[PDB]
Swiss-Prot record, chain A:
The gene is RPB9. The modification Phosphoserine is found at residue 39. Gene3D superfamilies: 2.20.25.10. Zn(2+) 2 binds at residues 74, 77, 102, 105. This is DNA-directed RNA polymerase II subunit RPB9.
From Swiss-Prot, chain C:
Belongs to the TFIIF beta subunit family. Present with 520 molecules/cell in log phase SD medium. This is Transcription initiation factor IIF subunit beta. The modification Phosphoserine is found at residue 19. TFIIF is composed of three different subunits: TFG1/RAP74, TFG2/RAP30 and TAF14. The chain holds residues 38 to 144 of 400 of the full protein. It comes from Saccharomyces cerevisiae (strain ATCC 204508 / S288c). It is found in: Nucleus. TFIIF is a general transcription initiation factor that binds to RNA polymerase II. Its functions include the recruitment of RNA polymerase II to the promoter bound DNA-TBP-TFIIB complex, decreasing the affinity of RNA polymerase II for non-specific DNA, allowing for the subsequent recruitment of TFIIE and TFIIH, and facilitating RNA polymerase II elongation. Residues 1-10 have a biased composition (Acidic residues). The gene is TFG2.
Swiss-Prot record, chain E:
It is found in: Nucleus. It comes from the Eukaryota. The chain holds residues 540 to 637 of 1224 of the full protein. The binding of ribonucleoside triphosphate to the RNA polymerase II transcribing complex probably involves a two-step mechanism. The initial binding seems to occur at the entry (E) site and involves a magnesium ion coordinated by three conserved aspartate residues of the two largest RNA Pol II subunits. Present with 18700 molecules/cell in log phase SD medium. It comes from Saccharomyces cerevisiae (strain ATCC 204508 / S288c) (Baker's yeast). Component of the RNA polymerase II (Pol II) complex consisting of 12 subunits. This is DNA-directed RNA polymerase II subunit RPB2. DNA-dependent RNA polymerase catalyzes the transcription of DNA into RNA using the four ribonucleoside triphosphates as substrates. Second largest component of RNA polymerases II which synthesizes mRNA precursors and many functional non-coding RNAs. Proposed to contribute to the polymerase catalytic activity and forms the polymerase active center together with the largest subunit. Pol II is the central component of the basal RNA polymerase II transcription machinery. Belongs to the RNA polymerase beta chain family.
From Swiss-Prot, chain F:
The chain holds residues 94 to 451 of 735 of the full protein. It comes from Saccharomyces cerevisiae (strain ATCC 204508 / S288c). It is found in: Nucleus. Present with 1920 molecules/cell in log phase SD medium. This is Transcription initiation factor IIF subunit alpha. TFIIF is composed of three different subunits: TFG1/RAP74, TFG2/RAP30 and TAF14. It comes from the Eukaryota. Belongs to the TFIIF alpha subunit family. The lineage of its organism: Eukaryota, Fungi, Dikarya, Ascomycota, Saccharomycotina. TFIIF is a general transcription initiation factor that binds to RNA polymerase II. Its functions include the recruitment of RNA polymerase II to the promoter bound DNA-TBP-TFIIB complex, decreasing the affinity of RNA polymerase II for non-specific DNA, allowing for the subsequent recruitment of TFIIE and TFIIH, and facilitating RNA polymerase II elongation. Phosphorylated on Ser and other residues by TAF1 and casein kinase II-like kinases.
Length: 116, 56, 107, 158, 98, 202, 91, 196
């Protein structure tokens, strides 16, 4: 939804319905600082979520000795060495799909076949 | 166990003892069987008191 | 100097000979906020030392704004005399340097 | 508005502006950088606290000063009992007219006096001073100056 | 167990000072937006600040413990997933040698 | 060594000009640039004072206005007690920082309240650039966090509590816009502006 | 000398430990009487166990071949060894 | 290295998952009511909201946790000053012997000497305490978003064993506290009644 803040007192902005132009304006509730909203979306509430599956991936994820090793094909540099792990979200209904991270180019590629 | 890699779902990684008692247990299998026996002892200890309660 | 606030009786003119206004004419001076290791802070913050003597030279290489220190030998020999002044911000916002001075309660 | 905010005035002056967040790193190529590394290793090696001290002498020698002992205390610390018991008040029966004139003089000096202040002012025995008080004066019972002897209204005019 | 020992606990203050003298930025002047990859540094459960290059710090600390400059009972843990460097010093921790 | 740079020598400050003055560190907190030479209404006043019961204190412009107008108008003892142990330095800090640093401009447009920071105030030193490009070393002692106060017409607490009580309904989204349209509990700068324009019109 | 290291349960969370040096460390016909050894097919170990039998306590170290027993029997023997009879002290 | 007192700080997420008005309230010691978070961060000198959820959220792309902390900043919205927050948290102080103007100093004492006391006891350390509280809330919301599971209470690393050292330490601490109290009582008596 990409919350945006006031540039004066660093408070979050709030939408307004106005009959002057019927356009989406976001206002600061403290110092009356106003701008146009760049998107009609003002609220999103996602129930089933794929965000957090690739969470925790860093530049030195290959330095972890506890992560298992595999020999899958990395389709950006064609490397035969990588680490892998399951989806990092801890929902009871997430799958066993693996997220292979190549160590040569830090490319994250999965093993899901229906999505591919 | 810290002797396995992360996200290992192999039978030996999650408590399948393939050796018999005659051939002896690998230490991971030994610890897993100790966990199972500990569960059995705890269940016996709670079940005796609870069933005596129910019987009285 | 404990004193009553919001004095509209203009008693501050009689009991304080110095002006209460902040002095701003040194605000245009450029200051470098420098963080020191423990030994350098110990020799650069002791009150039994620092009698105004020079401590070193600052080499500012203009090729890539690389700033290095060339300390004098007046302090020690076991410590290094060349140091690298790393910068994480070339422009520091909303940060100034100010001093405090006690007022004159007499006359 | 309220004309009281408790402001402590002090002379203040801006003495410059900072534009560079500077930090000092020791140079790797300096020969004395290894002295700094060894110094930091000595810092993380040294201990700030020492061990306890074990008395290696005979235990009875240590216990001789303890509790049930010959060695009476020779310290003067907090000996308020001996230094407050050395002040003794001794006085005799001075004749009645002199002490009543003294009481009248003190009543003229200030009308209300307690027992202790009057006794330390006149240096007289408590029984005789009490007799000379209730002969010619009385103490307040329920007033704001209660438990203080004041002159009678009959003698107040003089 | 037979080989398990229990830490008696040492002072964490030398460790905190050592961290502060090796690029562990103090928590007072840390901004997450300008340092999004910074690894939080915990000493006995106290967040003391962040470090930009946690791997070099961890290998330095491990070499120091292995050479005995740090007390061997001091346990240092780098969890790479959420970028935390936890260092434990207090007593009561059961450890075993490996 | 060839001199392809500008090697300015570094000198220390004497110890004679360090006693009876303390060189602290200023630090504002705003996403925009704050500059007292431009953004502040001169004269600017900085003193350590009580911040208790703000929005009721008039700034120096209205103070000298009131001074001018009144110049025109006039012309059993408990014996022993426990004494808890406390270190001298922290006691001095607590008594000193019992009142915060508050710096304001003349009209009260920019009121900044200081907060003490002790995290790394001891490891910091100042290298002021001299008039000839040289550097003077000043050992900094304290660092103060300065925050602007009552810039967007902040309010009191009793109204906030009665809005947070559940006897009333949902709090409206644009309440202080309506209140500023009414004209109640404005900024200190606007409150000084109303009195200044009332006095100056006569 | 950095040859052995003290590891607690937090530090166990971020390391990989081998059972035996002669088995799991070097890069990889078998006796049918021996138990099946899995080599874990991965060589990124940071530590190795000193000896796996050292996971037992004092009482369980008395049991001969405790890996060939049902675990509750080992627990019973561990509890029973305190009731054994023998010399407890030489004095 | 202090009074060896144990203070429990609970950061609790009110409202169920099906509920939409999910606000976070923290259980401060010596305070009757559970204070919302934003009031506490403003009481720690972090007045503007942006730095508050900067202390909460370290990844600007993690929009979901920002969404679910939006009702918290909406709830702690009427308070926009540090001193107002200080009065608001000090008015439910469990003292009932403090006046109007001493509420601020009382709440400052509450937040300094026993709010996260394992970090520091001194003043001028509100920034690190605020960062740690933001870290606590970040862990709470990571568990609420199921990015991380709840903490295992049976994990042996999270456990300590009090041996003869620590046990005799706390016992001797209690006994020496009592002995110092007795010495002070004896001193007070021998001054007030003066029998040496
Ligand atoms: Zn605004
Ligand atoms: Zn690749």
């Amino acid at each position: 939804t990409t919350f945006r803040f006031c540039r004066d007192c660093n408070n979050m902005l709030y939408p307004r319905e106005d009959k002057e132009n019927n356009r989406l304006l976001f206002e600061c509730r403290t110092c009356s600082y106003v701008e146009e909203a760049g998107s009609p979306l003002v609220y999103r509430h996602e129930l089933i979520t794929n965000i957090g599956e690739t969470a925790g991936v860093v530049q030195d994820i290959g330095s972890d000795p506890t992560l298992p090793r595999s020999d899958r094909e990395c389709p950006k540099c064609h490397s035969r060495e990588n680490v892998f792990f399951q989806s990092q979200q801890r929902r009871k209904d997430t799958s066993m799909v693996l997220f292979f991270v190549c160590l040569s180019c830090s490319h994250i590629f999965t093993s899901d076949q229906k999505n591919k | 166990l810290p002797h396995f890699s992360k996200d290992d779902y192999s039978p030996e990684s999650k408590g399948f003892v393939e050796n018999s008692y005659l051939r002896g247990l690998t230490p991971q299998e030994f610890f897993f069987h100790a966990m199972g026996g500990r569960e059995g002892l705890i269940d016996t200890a709670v079940k005796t008191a609870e069933t005596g309660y129910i019987q009285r | 100097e404990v004193f009553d606030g919001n004095d509209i009786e203009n008693n501050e003119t009689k009991v304080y000979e110095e002006s209460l206004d902040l002095d701003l004419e040194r605000s245009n001076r450029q200051v470098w906020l420098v963080r020191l290791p423990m030994f350098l802070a110990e020799k650069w913050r002791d009150r039994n030392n620092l009698h105004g003597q020079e401590l070193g030279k600052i080499r500012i290489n203009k090729d890539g704004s690389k700033i290095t220190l060339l300390l004098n030998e007046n302090d020690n020999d076991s410590i290094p005399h060349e140091y690298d002044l790393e910068l994480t911000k070339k422009v520091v916002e909303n940060e100034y340097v100010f001093t405090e001075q006690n007022l004159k309660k007499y006359q | 508005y309220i004309p009281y905010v408790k402001t402590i005035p002090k002379k203040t002056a801006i003495v410059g502006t900072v534009c560079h967040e500077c930090q000092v790193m020791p140079s790797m190529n300096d020969p004395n950088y290894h002295k700094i590394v060894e110094q930091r290793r000595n810092i993380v090696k040294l201990n700030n606290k020492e061990r306890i001290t074990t008395l290696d002498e005979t235990v009875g020698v240590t216990m001789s000063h303890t509790g049930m002992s010959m060695r009476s205390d020779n310290s003067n610390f907090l000996k308020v009992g001996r230094e407050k018991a050395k002040s003794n008040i001794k006085s005799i029966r001075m004749p009645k007219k002199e002490i009543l004139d003294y009481l009248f003089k003190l009543f003229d000096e200030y009308d209300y006096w307690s027992l202790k202040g009057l006794k330390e002012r006149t240096r007289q025995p408590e029984a005789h001073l009490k007799e000379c008080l209730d002969k010619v004066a009385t103490l307040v019972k329920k007033g704001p100056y209660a438990f203080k002897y004041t002159l009678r209204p009959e003698y107040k005019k003089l | 167990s037979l080989m398990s020992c229990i830490s008696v606990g040492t002072d964490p203050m030398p460790i905190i000072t050592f961290l502060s003298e090796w690029g562990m930025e103090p928590l007072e002047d840390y901004v997450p937006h300008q340092s999004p990859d910074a690894t939080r540094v915990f000493v006995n459960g106290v967040w003391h600040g962040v470090h930009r290059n946690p791997a070099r710090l961890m290998e330095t600390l491990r070499t120091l413990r292995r050479k005995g400059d740090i007390n061997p009972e001091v346990s240092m843990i780098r969890d790479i997933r959420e970028k935390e460097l936890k260092i434990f010093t207090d007593a009561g921790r059961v450890y075993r040698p490996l | 060594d060839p001199n392809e740079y500008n090697e300015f020598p570094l000198r220390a400050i004497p110890k004679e000009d360090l006693e009876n003055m303390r060189t602290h560190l200023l630090k504002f907190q705003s996403k925009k640039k704050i500059n007292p030479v431009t953004d502040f209404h001169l004269p600017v006043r900085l003193h350590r004072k009580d911040t208790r019961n703000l929005q009721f204190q008039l700034t120096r412009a209205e103070i000298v206005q009131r001074q001018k107008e009144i110049s025109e108008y006039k012309k059993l003892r408990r014996k022993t007690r426990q004494l808890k142990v406390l270190d001298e330095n922290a006691k001095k800090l607590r008594f000193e920082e019992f009142y915060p640093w508050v710096m304001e401009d003349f009209d009260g447009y920019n009121t900044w309240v200081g907060s003490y920071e002790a995290g790394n105030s001891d490891s910091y030193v100042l290298l002021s650039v001299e008039d000839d490009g040289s550097f003077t070393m000043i050992p900094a002692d304290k660092v103060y966090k300065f925050t602007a106060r009552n810039k967007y017409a902040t309010l009191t607490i009793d109204e906030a509590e009665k809005r947070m009580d559940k006897k009333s309904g949902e709090v409206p989204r644009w309440l202080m816009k309506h209140l500023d349209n009414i004209g109640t509990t404005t900024t200190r700068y606007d409150r000084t502006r109303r009195k200044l324009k009332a006095v100056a019109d006569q | 000398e950095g040859l052995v290291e003290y590891i607690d349960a937090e530090e166990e969370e971020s390391i990989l430990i081998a059972m035996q040096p002669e088995d799991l460390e070097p890069a990889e016909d078998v006796d049918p009487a021996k138990r099946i050894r899995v080599s874990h097919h991965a060589t990124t170990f940071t530590h190795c166990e000193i000896h796996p039998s050292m996971i037992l306590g004092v009482a369980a170290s008395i049991i001969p071949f405790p890996d060939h027993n049902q675990s509750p029997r080992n627990t019973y023997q561990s509890a029973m060894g305190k009731q054994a009879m023998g010399v407890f002290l030489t004095n | 290295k202090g009074s060896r007192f144990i203070s429990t700080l609970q950061v609790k997420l009110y409202g169920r998952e099906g509920s939409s008005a999910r606000t976070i309230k923290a259980t401060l010691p010596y305070i009757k009511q559970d204070i919302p978070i934003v009031i506490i961060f403003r009481a720690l000198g972090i007045i503007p909201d942006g730095e508050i959820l900067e202390h909460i959220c370290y990844d600007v792309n993690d929009w979901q946790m920002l969404e679910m902390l939006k009702p918290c900043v909406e709830d702690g919205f009427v308070i926009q000053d540090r001193e107002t927050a200080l009065d608001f948290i000090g008015r439910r102080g469990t003292a009932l012997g403090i006046k109007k103007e001493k509420r601020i100093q009382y709440a400052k004492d509450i937040l300094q000497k026993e709010f996260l006391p394992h970090i520091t006891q001194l003043e001028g350390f509100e920034s690190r305490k605020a960062f740690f509280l933001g870290y606590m809330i970040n862990r709470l919301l990571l568990c609420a978003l199921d990015r991380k599971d709840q903490d295992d209470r049976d994990h042996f690393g999270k456990k300590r064993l009090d041996l003869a050292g620590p046990l005799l330490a706390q016992l001797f601490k209690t006994l020496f506290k009592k002995l110092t109290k007795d010495i002070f009582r004896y001193m007070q008596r021998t001054v007030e009644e003066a029998h040496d």
